[PDB]
Amino acid sequence: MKRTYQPNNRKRAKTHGFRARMKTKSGRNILARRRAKGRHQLTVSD
Amino acid sequence: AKHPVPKKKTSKSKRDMRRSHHALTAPNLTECPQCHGKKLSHHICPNCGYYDGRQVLA
Amino acid sequence: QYRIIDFKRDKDGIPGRVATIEYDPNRSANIALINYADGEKRYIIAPKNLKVGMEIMSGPDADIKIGNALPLENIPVGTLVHNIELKPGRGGQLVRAAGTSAQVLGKEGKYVIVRLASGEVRMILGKCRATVGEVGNGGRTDKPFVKAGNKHHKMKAPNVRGVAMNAVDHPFG
RNA sequence: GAGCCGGUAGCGGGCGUGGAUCCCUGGAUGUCCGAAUGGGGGAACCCGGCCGGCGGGAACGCCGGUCACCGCGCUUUUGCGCGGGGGGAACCUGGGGAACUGAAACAUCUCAGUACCCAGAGGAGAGGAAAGAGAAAUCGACUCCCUGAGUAGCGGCGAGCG
RNA sequence: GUGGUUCGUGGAGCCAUGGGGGAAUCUGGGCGGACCACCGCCUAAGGCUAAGUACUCCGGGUGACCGAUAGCGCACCAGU
RNA sequence: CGAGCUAGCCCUGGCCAGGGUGAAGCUGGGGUGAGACCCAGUGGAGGCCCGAACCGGUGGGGGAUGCAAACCCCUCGGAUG
RNA sequence: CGAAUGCCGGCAUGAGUAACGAUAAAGAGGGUGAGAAUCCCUCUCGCCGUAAGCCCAAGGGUUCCUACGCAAUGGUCGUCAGCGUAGGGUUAGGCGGGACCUAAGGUGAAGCCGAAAGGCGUAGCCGAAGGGCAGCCGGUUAAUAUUCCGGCCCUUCCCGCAGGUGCGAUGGGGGGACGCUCUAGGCUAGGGGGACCGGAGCCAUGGACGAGCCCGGCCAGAAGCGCAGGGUGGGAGGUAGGCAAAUCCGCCUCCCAACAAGCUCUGCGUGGUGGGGAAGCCCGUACGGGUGACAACCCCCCGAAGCCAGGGAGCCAAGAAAAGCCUCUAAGCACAACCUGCGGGAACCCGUACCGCAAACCGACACAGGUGGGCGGGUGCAAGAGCACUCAGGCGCGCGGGAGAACCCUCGCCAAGGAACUCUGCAAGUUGGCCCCGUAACUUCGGGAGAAGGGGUGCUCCCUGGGGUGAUGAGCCCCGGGGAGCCGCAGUGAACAGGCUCUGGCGACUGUUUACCAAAAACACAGCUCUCUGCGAACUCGUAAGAGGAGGUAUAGGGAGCGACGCUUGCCCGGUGCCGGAAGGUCAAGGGGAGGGGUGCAAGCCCCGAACCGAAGCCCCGGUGAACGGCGGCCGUAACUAUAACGGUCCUAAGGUAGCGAAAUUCCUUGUCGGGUAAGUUCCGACCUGCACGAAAAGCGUAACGACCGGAGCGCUGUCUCGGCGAGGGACCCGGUGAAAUUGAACUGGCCGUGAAGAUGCGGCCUACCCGUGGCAGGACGAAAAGACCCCGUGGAGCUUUACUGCAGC
RNA sequence: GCGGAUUUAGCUCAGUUGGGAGAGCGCCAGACUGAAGAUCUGGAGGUCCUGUGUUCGAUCCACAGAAUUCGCACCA
């Protein structure tokens, strides 16, 4: 029933990810956003 | 698709009555044949083995 | 196979013998691999005729030897050309497939008259160039596309139409 | 100033009045990522030159150290030696810069130069000694409070703004 | 042809500019809101300038502030 | 903020058990110049036929606080494009 | 603070009724436990088996073993776990990723354009089970293994010396490289029969000890080597000289230009090992086997959908970028460079355990969903991963006993009739395999054909033919063949397998598409038509830059109504878009002077400024329809009766042409005739007063084709005259487990009436004991959802034109 | 039942001071012909729908009421 969640390492890591996030304005942005804003870790960390 | 699901709470009281008709009755039991103890009317037991025949153990 | 090759000779004197029939899959153009003096070759412009029998070229000089080229300068009035070079050497400037090509239908000053294949008439400039004769498109039209859609086969855009879509949709539609 | 091996109480073993635990400041280390900048890259991982000890190399041969991105001047020479950047809750200024909503509609308009996004300086930036003010021939940085005025007035002179 | 300004194109200026014209260096040149005469005012078209107001990550105090469904949502192996 | 939804477009591999039909082709035989063109043999093209993996999901049947937020059953189409 | 279908949190409801997650089944014996249907061994039996197989990977990620242990998870248990605690378990120069190569695509010093963040982007980098690349089989623990052991085969890099030679870039060359469909040659997989060899034992039973049952009779290897193809050609010179630099290779010429020699996979092999099952004396004789006979190790068979091989053939829509190899600079060797030998040395970074057509992967659960590759064992079947049964290996679905009622589910049965049920033959039956016999109207002659219509088959004996079988001589296979015969209701025995027919509508047709309703006459289309474009094109994104277009170039690219083909597309540009005209009117900014005006002592200094000139536009003149679009009215007449042959007109742009007509465009209508039927408002055929068809949004037709839709007939059958009976599933009783919405509350009758007007609880009256479970639906205006049909709020969002205003681009 | 417009000499049509009315076609006489027809000559002919009403007077102006033809008509 092809849900949507099938995790494709290659991909998930790929399409998102530290690096990626830095890569752009937005990315970095909300990146610090959280950083400070609440702790946590981050995408790829996951 | 709940066409009909109770319409009113059920009355504590009555509810319980419903339950009411329901009565527990301990198994009729009778004392042994000779393994002298009380037993399940009609049967050998971890007391007996008899009846008229030594079939059982312990 | 998914590639191009030539479209403008400009190192002349070099014998160009019509190598061979490599009728070609990429721009309605059959072409021949051309074999030049030095061994240096060129999958070159179809121009119908000039048989397998390698045999011509073109150049500074002339040799209205059908097929072959030169400026419109070195060019006979009443001649069918293609290799249609508009501005002073921008490769060929027209008639690809385009059987009927352009006609030196009169030329004046550093400007020469082209009956413009595509369907009109006007001029190019001086030493500009062109090669004449035929294209080589064999009617290169019709053909059936019977039970299936040759199109789709086309690999070439089953970019299918629409225009009546139940919509709001696309650019002048 | 005399107890301590942190929140774990426990075990097993120990340090100290020949000023211990700990309070302070000023120290060396400071793995790998993150401006990351030596190179690559799904960070935190995998790749390169010299010095480096010489290392087992038991009758056989290393890590460690180190080291170089790029925009910046310019002593240009062959360019050597400087500054940058990456942050930051909210504050500042400049770049850019909106609908709802009010006008009981809604095109002016108001919401506002508001929200937001941006670049950037700071610890505060803003700004800041006059082609000003105003007119009593009078005043003299720039800013910020009160006051001036909700006046002078802007305006489908309508909401409101001021 | 736009901006700021209280100015919503207006009797409507000052400064700032987009695009074309393209001055004068002290009897120069703007200015006082159309403009004109006289007066009054300033001297542009470069730069620096601590302090007087803002702000709260952090430290302190204090509260007719709170009491765990109220206080920051989180008083403690919570932005987990 | 999202094409590991999905529809698309690019690049690059994998895949279609069986079986049927039988054109262009060429081989030879056919009264005429040659030839048309016939016939026969060979031949093995088709988004071609029958049918499964594969792909799909009308038609009836079940389910309806379901195995499940679309499924199970009978049935049905494509099946070298 | 009842009180906001309130938020938070407890807590009761139905309710001990509903459910246990696929009707692929269980039962017995013993074992262990505190206690076991639910754990362990064991013997009956059922289910897979093309999978319920094992495997590669993806994903998850310690879930794995081993000793412990069960509180919750495990929809019952539970001494069992993929539960808990703890210990322990995954090693590679040659497996794989990298340490190499590049297209897409991303990055990207330089370069290009932005208001700033940015864009785009060379080359170089990144970027793959696409390229590339040096071994395999036995063994061996609780666990890992192509990595541990061992046997056997290698690889690169280094020092040396030996023999060797213009070595020496990567720049050059060739070079690695390719579609699809098909098919010759030859070879292990793999499978098959051997009574042929080895062994552990049987027969029981009527019988057979005998070509009898039964187990197997390989797997791996340096090279040497004959089955075997696999990829090239040789030398000289010229080299107007290129591939920017010269020998390469490219191009011309004269000579060997073969079944030649050259260089990369299969057999033999075999070195030599391993294994090898059945053992098997210690030893558990049993959670059986870990560990010793000894194995036999032979022949003929059949043969691949990818193995050689980059085949070979045919075809169009005509099949990727960087190692290695030769050619060479810079260069440096050139008694020390490359190639080649042998000997010593050296060889890393991350990866495995188990799951893994799945309770360990996505679905929030051990949810009959899905999820990419590898032969997929055999017997029967014309062939085949289809079918029925099984092999190896897997499983018994995680709740079990027990009755057998309605009534739902799934499934089998019928006599006689045999759609009439009904909207509808919906469904479900008929039919269903291969061979022969036969084959209709129509035809775009291919095909409608499987059409339709018959008859066939089972095993035995008898004689005859043939293709692989090294001649051919146990050995295999396609095949008849004809003859005689046997037995059953039955002889594709069961399992997998079309009902046809006639006819009409539309659309051609195969398609695609509305994920969880609708595959359709809808879009797609092969095809046709007007058509805009000359390239730095026309249009589409873009703030410039740019990319797109197209490395396309008018047989081309973009707009587009129709959508094979056949026949044919007619009448009107007066409005309109548009194509063209551009002389004339008009009109923005602009240019340009009369004038007026304020202040001015005066020069001067500021506006207003208009005759005249001045842009697209629009007006007007034309063209223009496969461009929007439009294509009349009633009075009369032969018509013994009716439009009409003709005729009177009034308005427009002309005022339906050819085919067709009650169609799905005809409400009056079941229009009237016809046929079909016992009757037919559906059909199908004609008429045609066509409420309101018409050629291009085609029109009339059209074979084939359609999960399309309607209209007929033979076949068949419980659809239907009602059916009735039966089989397996819940329901019901048992024990274990033990939700859920709606709900003020409640010990809640019928009546006739009544109230807001369709009343259990108001009135008068009549039955009426207290409780419950299996049931049947009627009422409790039942549940579910603060109507989506409505109207209302100077509510919202999509789209439309000659609505307003504007912005874009022209 | 609602709307718009129309009812004139036999037929199709025209007029907004309203002031006092034909256009073409039909019909009888005159020709032209041997004849008829087409064709020149003359003519004859109207409640401007029924009834009202405002009006000096209006069929051309108004109000009902006949027939005309046209539009209309949905929501579930």
Curated annotation (Swiss-Prot), chain C:
Protein function: One of the primary rRNA binding proteins. Required for association of the 30S and 50S subunits to form the 70S ribosome, for tRNA binding and peptide bond formation. It has been suggested to have peptidyltransferase activity; this is somewhat controversial. Makes several contacts with the 16S rRNA (forming bridge B7b) in the 70S ribosome.
Complex formation: Part of the 50S ribosomal subunit. Forms a bridge to the 30S subunit in the 70S ribosome, contacting the 16S rRNA. May also make transient contacts with protein S6 during translation in the 70S ribosome.
Family to which this protein belongs: Belongs to the universal ribosomal protein uL2 family.
Name recorded for this polypeptide: Large ribosomal subunit protein uL2
Full-protein residues shown: 61 to 234 of 276
